[PDB]
Amino acid sequence: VPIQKVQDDTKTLIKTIVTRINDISHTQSVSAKQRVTGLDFIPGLHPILSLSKMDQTLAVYQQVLTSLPSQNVLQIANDLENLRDLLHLLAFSKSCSLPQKPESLDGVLEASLYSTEVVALSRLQGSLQDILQQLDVSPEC
Amino acid sequence: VPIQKVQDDTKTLIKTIVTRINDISHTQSVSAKQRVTGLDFIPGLHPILSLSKMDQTLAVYQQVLTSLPSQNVLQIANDLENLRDLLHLLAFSKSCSLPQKPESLDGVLEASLYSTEVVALSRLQGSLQDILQQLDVSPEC
Amino acid sequence: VPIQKVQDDTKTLIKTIVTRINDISHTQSVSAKQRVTGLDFIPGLHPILSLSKMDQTLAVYQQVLTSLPSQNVLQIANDLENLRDLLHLLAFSKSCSLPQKPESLDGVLEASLYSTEVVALSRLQGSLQDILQQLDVSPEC
Amino acid sequence: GTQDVVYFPPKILTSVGSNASFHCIYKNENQIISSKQIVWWRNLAEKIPEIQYSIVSDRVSKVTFSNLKATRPRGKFTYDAVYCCNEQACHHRYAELYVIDVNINISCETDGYLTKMTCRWSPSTIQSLVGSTVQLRYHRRSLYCPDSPSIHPTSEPKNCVLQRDGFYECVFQPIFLLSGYTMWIRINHSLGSLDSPPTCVLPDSVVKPLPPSNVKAEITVNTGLLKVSWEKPVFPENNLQFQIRYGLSGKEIQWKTHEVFDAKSKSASLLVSDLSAVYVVQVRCRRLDGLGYWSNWSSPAYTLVM
Amino acid sequence: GTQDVVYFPPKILTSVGSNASFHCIYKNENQIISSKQIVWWRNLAEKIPEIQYSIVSDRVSKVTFSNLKATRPRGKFTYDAVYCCNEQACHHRYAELYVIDVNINISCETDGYLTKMTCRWSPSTIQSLVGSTVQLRYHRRSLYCPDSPSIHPTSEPKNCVLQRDGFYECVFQPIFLLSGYTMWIRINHSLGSLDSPPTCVLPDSVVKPLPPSNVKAEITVNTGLLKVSWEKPVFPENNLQFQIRYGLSGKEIQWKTHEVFDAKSKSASLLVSDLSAVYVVQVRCRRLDGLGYWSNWSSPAYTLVM
Amino acid sequence: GTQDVVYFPPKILTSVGSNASFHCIYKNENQIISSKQIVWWRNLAEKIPEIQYSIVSDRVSKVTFSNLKATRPRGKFTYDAVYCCNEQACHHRYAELYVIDVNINISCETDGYLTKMTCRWSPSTIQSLVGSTVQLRYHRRSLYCPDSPSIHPTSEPKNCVLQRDGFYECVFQPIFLLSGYTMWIRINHSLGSLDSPPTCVLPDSVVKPLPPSNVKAEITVNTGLLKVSWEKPVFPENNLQFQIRYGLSGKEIQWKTHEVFDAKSKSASLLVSDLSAVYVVQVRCRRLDGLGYWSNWSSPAYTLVM
Numbered sequence A, B, C: 001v002p003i004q005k006v007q008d009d010t011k012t013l014i015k016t017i018v019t020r021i022n023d024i025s026h027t028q029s030v031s032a033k034q035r036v037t038g039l040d041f042i043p044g045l046h047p048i049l050s051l052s053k054m055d056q057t058l059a060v061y062q063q064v065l066t067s068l069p070s071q072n073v074l075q076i077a078n079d080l081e082n083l084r085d086l087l088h089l090l091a092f093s094k095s096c097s098l099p100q101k102p103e104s105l106d107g108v109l110e111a112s113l114y115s116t117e118v119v120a121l122s123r124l125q126g127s128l129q130d131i132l133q134q135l136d137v138s139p140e141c
Numbered sequence D, E, F: 001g002t003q004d005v006v007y008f009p010p011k012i013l014t015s016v017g018s019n020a021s022f023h024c025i026y027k028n029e030n031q032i033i034s035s036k037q038i039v040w041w042r043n044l045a046e047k048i049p050e051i052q053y054s055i056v057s058d059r060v061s062k063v064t065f066s067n068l069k070a071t072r073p074r075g076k077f078t079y080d081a082v083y084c085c086n087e088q089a090c091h092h093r094y095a096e097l098y099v100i101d102v103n104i105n106i107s108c109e110t111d112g113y114l115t116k117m118t119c120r121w122s123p124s125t126i127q128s129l130v131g132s133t134v135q136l137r138y139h140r141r142s143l144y145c146p147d148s149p150s151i152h153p154t155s156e157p158k159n160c161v162l163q164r165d166g167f168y169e170c171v172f173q174p175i176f177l178l179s180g181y182t183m184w185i186r187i188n189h190s191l192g193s194l195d196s197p198p199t200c201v202l203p204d205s206v207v208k209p210l211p212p213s214n215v216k217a218e219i220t221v222n223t224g225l226l227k228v229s230w231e232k233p234v235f236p237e238n239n240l241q242f243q244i245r246y247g248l249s250g251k252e253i254q255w256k257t258h259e260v261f262d263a264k265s266k267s268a269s270l271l272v273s274d275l276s277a278v279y280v281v282q283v284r285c286r287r288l289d290g291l292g293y294w295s296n297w298s299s300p301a302y303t304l305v306m
């Protein structure tokens, strides 16, 4: 398995997910830095430096997007499944392993669906742009 | 409410009903003067001079046509409902009120449907032409 | 009833059945003389000379073809019904009457459908060509 | 008063061309009037001519209709109302006269493979009459058709399918080529039943063969002839006649026809005026005895020039 | 911390052009903040101008929207999320503002036989909003239409059929020609109901007559005139005006029109320049009082030349 | 007499190109004949060449078929009847040999939005074989395709829809862009099952992009150049190559093509011979690495002249 191709395909997939989020109209108008209270369980302020931090971050977004009822989020959730596997394949190359969070998400989906979806996709885009920008620099396990 | 328009619309509606009866082929060939026995409960020989006589005459034709099973008679029955209301509106103008007949009709419909329908529509046409011709002369209540 | 027309129509019908069997592809490649064991209850070696022998021969083929599940055989079975009636009509002309066989056929249809159908149609064709060739010579009852 | 009329019979169901008679009793206020006082009317529109009346007795009048025309429906009314009247004064009770054109023609055609027979008929004269059923009935005779077909008491219904053209198509499959199929249309009305004139068809005699195949057209310049050749269709086995149509190939073909009555002929030689023109040729066939239809024209065959 | 927001009311359902106000309480960690600290946001995308804010009290802030435009849906979200925020920091809870363009126009047309009235309307402004029902409602007044139509509390639903063009068609049959039919579209949403502005139609006043029949066009060479004649349609019984269009018959007709305001006119004489040309003529009609539609143009009539 | 035959095995289900062998015992009237007396036949039509026979033992004969061709069906019979015969005399019992062309090609295409993958396959070689089921099966590998695809024991059925062209279309939605989808057609026959050669597809590698958008064509008279410009489609994110076709606008365009291999190029300048003519231009794109399809040609762009 060519690692050079895996690193290039990981970057291409991240760009693909970012483009999908740009097409979801109600997310581009929202500032990913401007904070919303009650949705602190969604990765945002964290710098995300390590392979295990990247993996745990994407798993949280994966769990969040599964609950949302849109087909746009279902496709992004499938891309995140490929992205997590690519990160595990990159962790394998450099001989390191990665492991497998309150459930107040159920309440915020029931009361504030618009805020949950918009903030999740807006935070995901910011997280992916951070992962992409740090993939050029050799990441720690 | 303009009474001049109500009198003109009453005459126009009567002409409309007469035209509908002309289109019903099996009624035009039948002489409205030539008497048929057993159907004396259908207005025909009466001169129809007053507003209350006109109203009671149209109510009898209304009750007769409701029992008949054709869609041509159903439309004529709706026009008669408008005509009775116009007569009540004309009776109101001239400060007068109007009130609300054997049921051997059930038997003549069962035994002689062709005679009931043909004679009812033929007698109705004659009655309407009499009402129209007497509307030019001021009618009594 | 013109007997000359009945004799000509019998010959035309036989030619028609033979042509139908030629169109059934899997029968033309099979030699009607080359014997198959276990299907001896199908007329083949017999010379077929008399009207009663012709009738009993066609009745056997009729019973065999009824059991077969094809629509090609169903049409041929109907032609055989006309052919048997024509033979009875020809027997009537010349003042003679005709009458009305193991059932191992059920077993050979269950085990060997291809052999039953192919051999029955191939033997029928040979039998019909024999009947046709002997119809020019006056046949005995 | 107690006025009433009685018709004998109350209703009549008959077909075009037939004669029909109604008898009547006019009981005026508990006493039957003289038949001389009775006049007859049609749909309260017109008095039937006195010429058609008959004094059956001192109390019974009769009206006779001759060579009846199909009753034209007036909306929901599919029957003509016949009235027994006491001079100028008619009664509400009438006799129902139903006259239906039962002259339906059924045409049958057996396919080129002799596997099925399709029969076609138009219900143009029955479509108006609803509240009654209309079906094709048939009986099969083991061999041939009788000289004069008859409505056999024992018959079977045939399932017919209404087509986009308004005709019914009934398909018999498989067929009995030499059996006589007697068929007719039965109208089952509330008053009784009417049957159209029966027709007997031998499926073998109504075959429309497939067109002749392998049609070739070539110009032999050594003789200056247009040689047309063909192969007769697989069915029928009976002798056939052929018809060849030929013309100069162009925008609108000006056809010329040649007839072939030799059953074993597979070619025709025609002397043409122009040897350097492209000719178009088509061939069609029919039973020599005329017991069948003409096949469709074969696919066009063309000659060459270069 | 225990941060929470309360909207008064939690959701607003209104129509285009209306005004809407939301009140809010921001409980920051068990204590209500000052209304001066509260800022408002739209879909977390843009701060609503402070000009629209109103200090109801020391703890209650208010936002007012004036002349509301129809809310543009963002995917599954048919409402606009209005936010009560504690300065830069907003909360996850929002108020749902639904603004629907309820200005649907209903147009009715009575057939040339005065037997039915067909009403048509487009749901182009309602198609996006699903999870709520959309139906035509109506009430009938015995005679005539009121000067200003009103949504009567007692009404009945009308069955409408979606057509291939995207419009709904509702057919009233039989009709009451001189009864006023007040109709409107009702949107039954989960939050409540909205009604479009009602319209009252008198079926007698929206008739599209059949075209004039027996249209003839002839050139009288003795006078050099093109004589056009017609027969007015069976309905309506009211006085009609006619319009005649005529031109030289050709590939693309260059039309000329003539208007007839005499209700009892059955002909028009036109002086034409060319007596040997074929002219094509069509006639259409409308109520002289203008209370109705123009009929379709009659089937073309042509003059002759030989 | 008590004659009987036994085949080992009674029936064989195999695919084109394979080899197949039948063994037989001929029990003539309660005693097994010598294998030297046994001859083999195909559908009672032709003796199989003795070259294919093998004397397994004194009583067992064997027939070997090499590089089997798909069995041509004879009506209802989808198998070839192989016969064990005692010299000229054959028996009614036969062995059923079924050879099916299982070489079905499956082609997949991912949409321009990377939301679904549609796979297409023709059942032209399986349509004849009824009484058995035919379905597309698949297995998904988390990332990428293996070098040589294999029929994984664990697979799932995919619902395919027959199209008007006779091909089946199977749609995967949502998709896993970088997962290897191994798919094949499984024929579940009464005798067993056959699987077509598996193919592995990476949805990311079979994308047919949307055409380039905002295509403009302008003639700069200062340089005498035809300037073509475009915008690459939204997807894919990978480097693309472009192809421009251009020609003089007319009845039947005589095309000329220009290839662009610079992934970040949004324009091309072409030196044309006629500056006063209208040119028509279209642009299409494909992944520079060739892992995908060409997009459709963009909507035509035209230059001006006045």
Ligand SMILES: *[C@@H]1O[C@H](CO)[C@@H](O)[C@H](O)[C@H]1NC(C)=O
Pocket: D018, D019, D066, D067
């Ligand atoms: C019907 O009446 C005509 C005229 O009297 C007569 O010629 C004909 O025979 C009658 N039909 C029958 C069946 O009697």
Ligand SMILES: *[C@@H]1O[C@H](CO)[C@@H](O)[C@H](O)[C@H]1NC(C)=O
Pocket: E018, E019, E066, E067
């Ligand atoms: C809506 O607000 C505008 C502006 O203040 C005002 O003119 C209008 O009257 C208001 N509408 C109602 C129904 O009060």
Ligand SMILES: *[C@@H]1O[C@H](CO)[C@@H](O)[C@H](O)[C@H]1NC(C)=O
Pocket: F018, F019, F066, F067
């Ligand atoms: C099939 O037979 C041919 C000829 O003997 C041979 O070359 C081939 O290897 C055989 N196939 C197998 C799978 O053994």
